[PDB]
Structure formats: C-alpha cells, structure tokens
Design a protein around this ligand. Structure first.
Ligand code: VO4
Length: 281
C-alpha cells in the first residue's frame, strides 16, 4: 500500500534483507509496483491521427496525466510527474521523432521549461533511440514557429551541458548524460549521483521555471530512475527517512513502466546505500 518509508539508520540492513536469497524480497516488492496505475486509459494516444507521433506503439501516456499542446493537434507523448515539492515538477516524454521535434519544442515553450535532462544517446549500438532534435553547432534553426540557437556547449566525460536561446511569441539548459545503457544502469552509483546533484543545483537556480523535462528513448526507465533518485536525494537531505518504494509508486500512478527494470530498482537502493555510508561516517 503505496509507501515503504525506511529510517536512515535502518536502511543498510533493510537493503541486505531485500538482497537476501537472490533478491527474493526485492523482487517481490518490485513486482507489486507492476500493478500501480493500471486502471488508466490511453485512448487519446491510440487515436489514428496520433499513431505516427509515438516512438513505441505500446508505451503511451495515460489520458489523465498527459501533457496537452495548445490546440488531434494537442497530442504529444509526454506526461506530468509529481516530485518532492510540487505536483507538476517534471514532464517526462519519449525521445522526439523527426516528425515530433517541433511539437517537443512547442511544449518546452508553452510550459515555460528552462531545464531539459536527456538520459539516452541518440543511437545506441546502432539502434536509433532519439532524433538529434537540437542544433548541431552554433548555427540557428527553426522548429515550428520557434527559432533555437546554441549559445554554449560543455563536454565532460560522462555528460554534456548545452545552453540555447529560444525565440517565439528565454535561455534553456540541456543536460545530456551519455553513459547510461537502455534497460540498464550506469557503471557506478557515484556518476549518476553527481549528475543528479548537478542538475538539481541548476534547477534550484532557475527562478520562475515550469517543470523540468526528463527523457530517454521511451521516457520510462532511465527517465523514471533519474526522477526517483532526484526525489530520494532530496529526502535524504531534509528528512529522517527515505521512501524508495513510495517514490516509484507515485511515478507509476502517472506514467506506465516508470523504473523499467528490476536492476534499475536495485540501483536506486545501491545509490542510497552509498550516500548514507558516506554521510553516517
Ligand atoms: O529509453 V528509456 O527505455 O530508459 O524508457
């Protein structure tokens, strides 16, 4: 039932218990989350006009929580997701297709988005996962009625940070994490922890912003794991308990498959374990 809050001083032992007997109890917990939100329809996403707008025909937003474009011309594959501190803290979306990248940027403009987090590569092992939907160098480009120009790019080993100016009628930061395999996990907990803390620092510096956009290719697994870690890290900094189950449960109420593999659910626990070890020390 919805929430499994663990005292910080009990977390190390809780996670051992979950891991005992080849993850027996961790598997049981993750399976329970499988049913959350499952009563909800995705009729709009299924409309024939919309077929070409979904990257995966079986990963679609719930009607109840989908993001609507101004006006079916209102459709984009994206969902609002609550966070630690407000109900539309994030918009999660699929990786834009060549034919929906104009819709993606229209959404970014309309929802006052200032920060976009991308956790897939464009092509992974030669499988296309996401269109390269921003400009390639400093040359400007139109996307629908908007013009976008890259102002800066900072390449680091595990992520790249870009800043764009957008003209419509704003500066947008793009955080591109380039070392997270689809259906898998990063090589270390430290890498994603550092990435999340970095993005949260920028979000905290973004007065006035609408939701933060987070996406991978389908916008469920890496996306959901990123959001869950962002929420649980804030819990750790402010609170005496941590509730990984409850975070993933709240995500699942809002979009299908959030935290898409059991290894990703394990990884959330390993990140929390690693942070608490460093702290209570
Ligand atoms: O591209 V994601 O499979 O991690 O939803």
């Amino acid at each position: 039932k919805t929430s499994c809050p663990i005292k910080i001083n009990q977390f190390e032992g809780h996670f051992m218990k979950l891991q005992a007997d080849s993850n027996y109890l961790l598997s049981k917990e993750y399976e329970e989350l499988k049913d959350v939100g499952r009563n909800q329809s995705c009729d709009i996403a299924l409309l024939p006009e919309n077929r070409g707008k979904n990257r995966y025909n079986n990963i679609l937003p719930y009607d109840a929580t989908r993001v609507k474009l101004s006006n079916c011309s209102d459709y984009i594959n994206a969902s609002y997701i609550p966070g630690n501190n407000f109900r539309r803290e994030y918009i999660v979306t699929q990786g834009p297709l060549p034919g929906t990248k104009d819709d993606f940027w229209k959404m970014v403009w309309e929802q006052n988005v200032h920060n976009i987090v991308m956790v897939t590569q464009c092509v992974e092992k030669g499988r296309v996962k996401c269109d390269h939907y921003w400009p390639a160098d400093q040359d400007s480009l139109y996307y629908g009625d908007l013009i976008l120009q890259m102002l800066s790019e900072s390449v680091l080993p595990e992520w790249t940070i870009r800043e764009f100016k957008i003209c419509g009628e704003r500066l947008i930061r793009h955080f591109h994490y380039t070392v997270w395999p689809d259906h898998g996990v990063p090589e270390t907990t430290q890498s994603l922890i550092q990435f999340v803390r970095t993005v949260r620092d920028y979000i905290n510096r973004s007065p006035g912003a609408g939701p933060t956009v987070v996406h991978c290719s389908a916008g469920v697994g890496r996306t959901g794991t990123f959001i869950a870690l962002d929420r649980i890290l804030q819990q750790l900094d402010s609170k005496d308990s941590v509730d990984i189950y409850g975070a993933v449960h709240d995500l699942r109420l809002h979009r299908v498959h959030m935290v898409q593999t059991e290894c990703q659910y394990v990884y959330l626990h390993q990140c929390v374990r690693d942070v608490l070890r460093a702290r209570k020390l």
